[PDB]
Paper text:
Vγ9Vδ2 T cells—a major subtype of human circulating γδ T cells—respond to multiple cancers and infectious diseases in an MHC-independent manner; they are specifically activated by small, non-peptidic diphosphate metabolites called pAgs. Here we show how—in both humans and alpaca—multiple pAgs function as ‘molecular glues’ to promote heteromeric association between the intracellular domains of [name] and the structurally similar butyrophilin BTN2A1. The [name]–pAg complex functions as a composite interface that directly binds to BTN2A1, bridged by the pAg molecule at the centre of the interface.
The relatively weak activities of PCP analogues can also be explained by the molecular glue model, as their enhanced pKa values lead to reduced binding to the basic residues of the butyrophilins.
Numbering used by the authors: 297 to 483
């Protein structure tokens, strides 16, 4: 609605491209670095320090330490996906639960129709329609991370008044083998 339109006018549109050096080896990062898909088997890649070696995650190339930013992600009909932001210093080696206290502010979909916010404990979301494009608002100084349906502007979830102390990266996670990719909408 009009509030979402006000916010998109205030917040700076971010041009997010995926960083292949961060992507778990089971992930396929597209050549234009806008899309991510899951491979049948892990790729033969180094275990460089930037790479998630357990979680099926990939980061954007640029992080945020200030300001108001937003980007939109086409999830389409994909039956499983989680997106949001995470701190630069999240645990990338070995499993960690993706939670705000561990530096992840994310939400998404499992099993086709189970929407969750990845809070601790996880919160189930009641969405009136399944989103096909999802917008992410980041307001660094106030500490707000918000998710919205990018087509009709309706609300999905707000993380409210977080105290950020690190740079923040867009983060993307996909677990399933299925033909629909995740694609970032360009700024
Ligand atoms: C197997 C993987 C994620 C499953 O995540 P996970 O076991 O941490 C969970 Cl089931 Cl706790 P989540 O979906 O609630 O985060 C690889 O990224």
């Amino acid at each position: 609605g009009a509030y979402n339109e006000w916010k998109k006018a205030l917040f700076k549109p971010a041009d997010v491209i995926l960083d292949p050096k961060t992507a778990n080896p089971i992930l396929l990062v597209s050549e234009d670095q806008r899309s991510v898909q899951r491979a049948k088997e892990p790729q033969d890649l180094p275990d460089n320090p930037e790479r998630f070696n357990w979680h099926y995650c990939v980061l954007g190339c640029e992080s945020f330490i200030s300001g108001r930013h937003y980007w939109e992600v086409e999830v389409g009909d994909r039956k499983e996906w989680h997106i949001g932001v995470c701190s630069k210093n999240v645990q990338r080696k070995g499993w960690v639960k993706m939670t705000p206290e561990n530096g992840f502010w994310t939400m998404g979909l499992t099993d086709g129709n189970k929407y969750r916010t990845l809070t601790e404990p996880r919160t189930n979301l009641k969405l009136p329609k399944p989103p096909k494009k999802v917008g992410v608002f980041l307001d660094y100084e106030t500490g707000d991370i918000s998710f919205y349906n990018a087509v009709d502007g309706s609300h999905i979830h707000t993380f409210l008044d977080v105290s950020f102390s690190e740079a923040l990266y867009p983060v993307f996670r996909i677990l399933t083998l299925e033909p629909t990719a995740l694609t970032i909408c360009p700024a």
